[PDB]
Amino acid sequence: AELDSLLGQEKERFQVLPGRDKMLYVAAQNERDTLWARQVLARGDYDKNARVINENEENKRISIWLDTYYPQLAYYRIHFDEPRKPVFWLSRQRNTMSKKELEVLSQKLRALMPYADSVNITLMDDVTAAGQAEAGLKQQALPYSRRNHKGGVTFVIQGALDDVEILRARQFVDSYYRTWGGRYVQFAIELKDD
Amino acid sequence: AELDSLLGQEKERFQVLPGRDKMLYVAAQNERDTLWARQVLARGDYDKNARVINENEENKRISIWLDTYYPQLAYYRIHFDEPRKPVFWLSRQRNTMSKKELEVLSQKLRALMPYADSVNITLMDDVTAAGQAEAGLKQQALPYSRRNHKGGVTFVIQGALDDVEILRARQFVDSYYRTWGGRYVQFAIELKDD
Amino acid sequence: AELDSLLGQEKERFQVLPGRDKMLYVAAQNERDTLWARQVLARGDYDKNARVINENEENKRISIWLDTYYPQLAYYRIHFDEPRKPVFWLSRQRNTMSKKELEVLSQKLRALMPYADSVNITLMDDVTAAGQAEAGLKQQALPYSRRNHKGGVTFVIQGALDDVEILRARQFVDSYYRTWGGRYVQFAIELKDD
Amino acid sequence: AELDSLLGQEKERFQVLPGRDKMLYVAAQNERDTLWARQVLARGDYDKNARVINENEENKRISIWLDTYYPQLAYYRIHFDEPRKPVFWLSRQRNTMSKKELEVLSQKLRALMPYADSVNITLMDDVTAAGQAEAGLKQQALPYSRRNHKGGVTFVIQGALDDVEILRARQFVDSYYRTWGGRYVQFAIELKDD
Amino acid sequence: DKDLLKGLDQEQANEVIAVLQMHNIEANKIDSGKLGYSITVAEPDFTAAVYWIKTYQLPPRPRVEIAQMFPADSLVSSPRAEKARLYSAIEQRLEQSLQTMEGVLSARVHISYDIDAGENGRPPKPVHLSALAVYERGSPLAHQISDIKRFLKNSFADVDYDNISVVLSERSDAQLQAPGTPVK
Amino acid sequence: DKDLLKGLDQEQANEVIAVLQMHNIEANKIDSGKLGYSITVAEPDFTAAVYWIKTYQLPPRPRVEIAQMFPADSLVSSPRAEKARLYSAIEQRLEQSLQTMEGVLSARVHISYDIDAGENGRPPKPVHLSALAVYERGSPLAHQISDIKRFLKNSFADVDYDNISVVLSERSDAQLQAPGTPVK
Amino acid sequence: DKDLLKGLDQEQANEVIAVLQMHNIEANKIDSGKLGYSITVAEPDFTAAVYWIKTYQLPPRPRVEIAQMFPADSLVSSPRAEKARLYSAIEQRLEQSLQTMEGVLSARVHISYDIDAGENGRPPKPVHLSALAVYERGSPLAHQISDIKRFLKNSFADVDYDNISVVLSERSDAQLQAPGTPVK
Amino acid sequence: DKDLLKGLDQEQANEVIAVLQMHNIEANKIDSGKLGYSITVAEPDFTAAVYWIKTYQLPPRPRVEIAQMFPADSLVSSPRAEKARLYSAIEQRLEQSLQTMEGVLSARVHISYDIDAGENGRPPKPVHLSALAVYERGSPLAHQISDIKRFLKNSFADVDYDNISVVLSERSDAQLQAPGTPVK
Structure with a gap:
């Protein structure tokens, strides 16, 4: 019962990974495919440890552990893209960890990810994160008020909104979140009467 | 009747632990799984001492004993994460216990946890706990009033609230609680007319 | 008919104790379990003296005897926790008993508890009892007025109350009572119109 | 079951491509044909890796990867036209990459496109992009207000609009988008009361 | 082998049994067809x-709702009766809604x-509302109460x-x- | 092999079963024709x-809607009844609409x-609206709420x-x- | 081989099946003639x-439209009822129109x-309109919205x-x- | 060989088929006489x-027109109903006219x-008109729109x-x- 044949006809929707922990992993790109694969494991059978991977769920799982063991660590989001070598965005300006400490950190992350062979920790500039957030926001001709504070920035959008600008606002926000994540830049859409 | 086969199809939802007291423990990550396992023990059978573990229930059990034998001890929350070696957050600034006294304390905690091999007591800085509480709170653009007092801090949120900011407020509070616990930082959401 | 098999499937809900008076005791942690065990003794059978133990009922039984033979004794609450060696909280500041007198006192308490092997009498500081009562009370952002008087302190809570603060108030009070007892600190919640 | 015979009667609607990854690709020029081909793959059969190509979907797939590995890269749109050698429009004025760096970039793009033999990266002048946007817009006799900002330009169209000018406006915008893409020039049609 | 209750409907029978089990008493539910259910217990537990x-x-009474006393079968109606009927329905509908909220078991x-x-000849008075709720054990009641109130x-x-x-x-x-x- | 519920309709039967399964209890649905459905469980789980x-x-009650108490079968009608009937329909129609929005499972x-x-002799009051919604897990609820409100x-x-x-x-x-x- | 639903009409049957397939569950539609449709599933998927x-x-309720509560079969009518009937028809007619626009799948x-x-004794209020729409994937929604609004x-x-x-x-x-x- | 739809009328049957073919699905139209039409598909496409x-x-609903809710069969009439009936007819008649213009396929x-x-006691309001149209591909829509509007x-x-x-x-x-x- 080869797992590849157990999964749907369009086998290219899933990336099967062979974890060093003897668990065969199923990387899915969407929660509909996540559920699909989970139903396969519960419905059919495969005599071997197995577990479905979901980019957001894994990002969260890691962030939980990470907060406990490395509290106050300033970071953005893990980009899984190529399962084998996920990229860890780390705040360049807020973290003062030494190279050796960063080595250790990546090793702990490798422990958290049975499939990943290595972790590419890289430092990102907080300014460029904020710059992109605001630039795109004003490109869309949206009204807003920026809130700089220690440790982050919030973009407040208030007042009555036109259905067109509402659509535009959400599209922008979702994309920003998908890329950078919501740990530094926080958006605040508030539909109110004037 | 191996317990692993007695528990659900997705065996990875539970972590079976072998306590030194001859009791086989079932660590569950959610009250739905807690109940699942309890029903297994009552429905089926297994000729051996057994007991289902729940992170919050154990945190509470310990805190009860701990208050009786170590009254006035200033602490936060036990992070079970890796069953074998749970982490005990202790107030760095409020406690003045000696290293030897802390050794004894960890030994008593080991007695309270039949499965745990050792206890990692570590000291946390009260300031950073409070700092994170307020920082995230204001990042969410929430209105509040801080109440510093000897032994703790309370964040009061009053007035009429927009459904959007209500949602945001709760999400933040739940996460803070999950991490640090509610022994130092207390939140007070009060939905009132203006 | 071994008592352990006579009691419920989850035998870990009860602690069977072998009293020196030839009575087999059943320690229960909750009145539902207290009743459970009592029904077992009345429904089934066991050819031997037996008696169900309840932490609060025993605390009360002792306090009755204690008031008659040691009137004016200033004390808080007996912590049964580990049946064998219950802890007796005694007012450090109000009692002036000699070490020898305290020895005798513990011996009388041992007589009152057929199962207990010894009694750990310890002296508590009245100030810390009061301090905790007020500290937690104000941490919860509750309105109150303290009433210090010779022999005790009362915390008066009047006025109209928000359903949220009502819940918080009770939770706090119940916990304080459970730990210290209501012999020194008295709470007085009075829901009234303004 | 030659794929050419599996696809519709008018075989000239599709361009079958032989990827170096052993996947036979089906290039479609329209989402109706995209779906057609996908239904063929799911309905019928072909013993070989296969995947339907869609110009917009591929443009998006690439842009995702590209943003992660080359963040802040200023570019416009990939013109697939002749599958074998797609053209990559790159901002001439905003990018300062060296020739060698551009070589590497094209190589990464080749990796992203299994069928493409090479990638023709070329630099476009931001001024001419903006010039065409405005020129056509005013040629159509449409009212607007230009918004130059760092990194882009937005064309705001407000007020009540005549059904005729509404039609004209959309036709223009769709064509501009199709050619240059919406990464530099953003249009903002807002039908409002005066 | 003692007879405890007879002629019970389905709901009542199951409710009574639940209580007896909670207090460590086994109970038999006997289906007598058109005659309803009967509950019997062991003589040792009977007392x-x-x-x-x-x-x-026990056994439980049927649930009381206001509309049950102002039926549509009446040949005539009055403003008083009609307004009461409406409010009765509204309370029921609100209960149906609260019981679908996350973590709510009963309301x-x-x-x-x-x-x-x-x-x-008087203007109407302000509307007062009250509600009861039961949550899944371990739930953060102190915060959840604000959703109910806002809703x-x-x-x-x-x-x-x-x-x-x-x-x-x-x-x-x-x-x-x-x-x-x-034991015997 | 114990009888739990009898005479259930189709909806009720499936709902009760869902709950039992959620709490790790197997259940049998028995079709007795005109007599409805019956639910039985293993004796080990019965308690x-x-x-x-x-x-x-359980079993669930039927859903309450306002129009159910002001039927068109009445020989006469009143402004009060008619206005109530209309609003009932409107709520239903709005529910039908929200449940078609992307990511909404129930509303x-x-x-x-x-x-x-x-x-x-008074002017009408402002209209108040409230709504509940359940989304597909992982959805960005904090933003989606604005579509509902605008709509x-x-x-x-x-x-x-x-x-x-x-x-x-x-x-x-x-x-x-x-x-x-x-286990046995 | 488990019975899931029975007595379904044609629409309901097809809708339920669509959902099950979406979540990776095979389902059988059984035509029992006058008794309607039945849906059965493999025991492995049943839970x-x-x-x-x-x-x-599931199964889906019938669609609610305002005119369904103010039928022409009534012996008498009122301005209130008649105006409601008209508006109901108008909403339906507008839906029929929007669904013919290019790229619109549902509205x-x-x-x-x-x-x-x-x-x-009051003058009429301004008319409010709202609408929902589903487009063919890949369509330029941000511009299409203006046609709907103008129309x-x-x-x-x-x-x-x-x-x-x-x-x-x-x-x-x-x-x-x-x-x-x-797999078996 | 799966049953998809049954009891379809002629219009519905042909419309559904058109859609399936558009999405690359073969479909059979079966004439069952008085029982209507049935649509069946190959098992590979069925999902x-x-x-x-x-x-x-699908299948399509019948077209809604205002006059359908204010029939001449009524024993009595009202100004409200009669005026509505007239307007309904007028819209239909205008549609019949626009569809005869050169290049118009549907309107x-x-x-x-x-x-x-x-x-x-109020004067009548200005009349508002709106219209939709589909033209033969390649036609100069930007100019044709002025004929419609003038007409x-x-x-x-x-x-x-x-x-x-x-x-x-x-x-x-x-x-x-x-x-x-x-392929098989």
Whole structure:
């Protein structure tokens, strides 16, 4: 019962990974495919440890552990893209960890990810994160008020909104979140009467 | 009747632990799984001492004993994460216990946890706990009033609230609680007319 | 008919104790379990003296005897926790008993508890009892007025109350009572119109 | 079951491509044909890796990867036209990459496109992009207000609009988008009361 | 082998049994067809069983709703009756809604009534609401209460945060174990 | 092999079963034709099964809608009744609409009523709306709430952003695994 | 081989099946003639199937339209009823029109009602409109929304661009693949 | 060999088939006489077929026209009903006219209604018109729109060029090729 044949006809929707922990992993790109694969494991059978991977769920799982063991660590989001070598965005300006400490950190992350062979920790500039957030926001001709504070920035959008600008606002926000994540830049859409 | 086969199809939802007291423990990550396992023990059978573990229930059990034998001890929350070696957050600034006294304390905690091999007591800085509480709170653009007092801090949120900011407020509070616990930082959401 | 098999499937809900008076005791942690065990003794059978133990009922039984033979004794609450060696909280500041007198006192308490092997009498500081009562009370952002008087302190809570603060108030009070007892600190919640 | 015979009667609607990854690709020029081909793959059969190509979907797939590995890269749109050698429009004025760096970039793009033999990266002048946007817009006799900002330009169209000018406006915008893409020039049609 | 209750309907039978089991008493449910259900117990428990039937007012009465006393079968109607009927339905509908919220196991809703404001030439009074709720054990009740209150606030023409009261708690330790038989 | 429930309709039967499975209890659905459905459970689980029937108020009651108490079969009608009937339909229609939005699994809608404004010589009051919603797990609820609110705002004669309340969440971890049989 | 649903009409049967397939569950549609349709599933999936029936409120209810509560069969009529009937028809007719626009797969339309303006000696209120729409995936929604809004603006006596709300999106990834059978 | 739809009328049957073919699905139309038409599909396509039936709200509903709710069979009539009946006919007649213009394949027309101007002692409101149109592909839509607008302007008592809205487009690439059978 080869797992590849157990999964749907369009086998290219899933990336099967062979974890060093003897668990065969199923990387899915969407929660509909996540559920699909989970139903396969519960419905059919495969005599071997197995577990479905979901980019957001894994990002969260890691962030939980990470907060406990490395509290106050300033970071953005893990980009899984190529399962084998996920990229860890780390705040360049807020973290003062030494190279050796960063080595250790990546090793702990490798422990958290049975499939990943290595972790590419890289430092990102907080300014460029904020710059992109605001630039795109004003490109869309949206009204807003920026809130700089220690440790982050919030973009407040208030007042009555036109259905067109509402659509535009959400599209922008979702994309920003998908890329950078919501740990530094926080958006605040508030539909109110004037 | 191996317990692993007695528990659900997705065996990875539970972590079976072998306590030194001859009791086989079932660590569950959610009250739905807690109940699942309890029903297994009552429905089926297994000729051996057994007991289902729940992170919050154990945190509470310990805190009860701990208050009786170590009254006035200033602490936060036990992070079970890796069953074998749970982490005990202790107030760095409020406690003045000696290293030897802390050794004894960890030994008593080991007695309270039949499965745990050792206890990692570590000291946390009260300031950073409070700092994170307020920082995230204001990042969410929430209105509040801080109440510093000897032994703790309370964040009061009053007035009429927009459904959007209500949602945001709760999400933040739940996460803070999950991490640090509610022994130092207390939140007070009060939905009132203006 | 071994008592352990006579009691419920989850035998870990009860602690069977072998009293020196030839009575087999059943320690229960909750009145539902207290009743459970009592029904077992009345429904089934066991050819031997037996008696169900309840932490609060025993605390009360002792306090009755204690008031008659040691009137004016200033004390808080007996912590049964580990049946064998219950802890007796005694007012450090109000009692002036000699070490020898305290020895005798513990011996009388041992007589009152057929199962207990010894009694750990310890002296508590009245100030810390009061301090905790007020500290937690104000941490919860509750309105109150303290009433210090010779022999005790009362915390008066009047006025109209928000359903949220009502819940918080009770939770706090119940916990304080459970730990210290209501012999020194008295709470007085009075829901009234303004 | 030659794929050419599996696809519709008018075989000239599709361009079958032989990827170096052993996947036979089906290039479609329209989402109706995209779906057609996908239904063929799911309905019928072909013993070989296969995947339907869609110009917009591929443009998006690439842009995702590209943003992660080359963040802040200023570019416009990939013109697939002749599958074998797609053209990559790159901002001439905003990018300062060296020739060698551009070589590497094209190589990464080749990796992203299994069928493409090479990638023709070329630099476009931001001024001419903006010039065409405005020129056509005013040629159509449409009212607007230009918004130059760092990194882009937005064309705001407000007020009540005549059904005729509404039609004209959309036709223009769709064509501009199709050619240059919406990464530099953003249009903002807002039908409002005066 | 003693007869405890007879002629019970399905709901009543299951409710009584639940209580007896909770207090460590085994009970038999006997289906007598058109004659309803009967509950019997072991003679050793019978005394205790009787005690608990008394204690908990068993078997349960049918649930009382206001509309049950102002039926549409009447040949005539009155403003008083019609307004009452409407409010009855509204309370029921609000209960149906609260029980779908995350973590809610059970909930009850009350709304104040107005039987003679307009009748006396007077303007209507402010609406008062109250509700009870039971949550899944371990749930953060102290915060959840604000959703209920906000929801109800805009669920009716004219209420406010001082005239809406919510009292709530959470379920007890589930009785997942059988009582067991008598020793003999 | 114990009888738990009898005479259930199709909806009720499936709902009760869902709950039992969620709590690790296998259940049989028996089709007795005109007599309805019956639910039976293994004796080892029976005690727990009863407990949960109590806990979740099972079997479920039929859904309450306002129009059910002001039927068109009446020989006569009144302004009061007719206006109520209309509002009932409107709430239903709004629920039908919200459940078609992307990511919405379930939604409920309430609208305030007006039973005697004009009756008392008074002008009508502002309309209040409230709604509940369940989303597909992982969905960005904090932003989606604004679509609901905007949609409802222009879906009725006179409402505003302060008199529309939306409370929402997302589904739980799907129960995709069978409970399993008892050990024996 | 488990029975899930029985007595379904044609629409309901096909809708439920669509959902089950979407979640990787095979389902059989059985034609029992006058008794309707029945849906059965493989025992391995049955648990999950039940879960989803609950989750999606299945089987679907019939669509609610305002005119259904003010039928022409009545011996008498009232201005209130007649005006309501008209508006109901108008909403339906507008939905029929929007669904013929290029790229639109589905659309729903709501119009505000007026039940007692003239009744109270008052002038009529401005008309509010709202609509939902689903487009073919890949379509330029941000511009298409202006056609809908313009069309509706002159489709009724007195509306404006601030009292017309449009919320829309596009279809998901089409389920073009069969779920597959269980392994055994 | 799966049953998809049954009991279809002629129009519905042909419409559903058109959609399935457009999405590369072969379909059989079976004439069962008095029982209507049935649509069946190949098992390989069945999953996709179901998906599309859902997506496009199939089978189609009957077209809604205002006069259908104010029939001449009524024993009595009212000014309100009669005026509505007239307008309904007028919209239909205008649609019949636009569809005869050169290059027009399909067109729909709406006219605003007046239900209570005179009723309230008020003068009538200006008439609003809106229309949809589909043209032969390649046609110069940007100019053709002016004929429609001019025609409609003098087709009614009191309209103007600001209260007439026309939204239009052209047909898609004709599906002139058969879907084809499954490979087996």
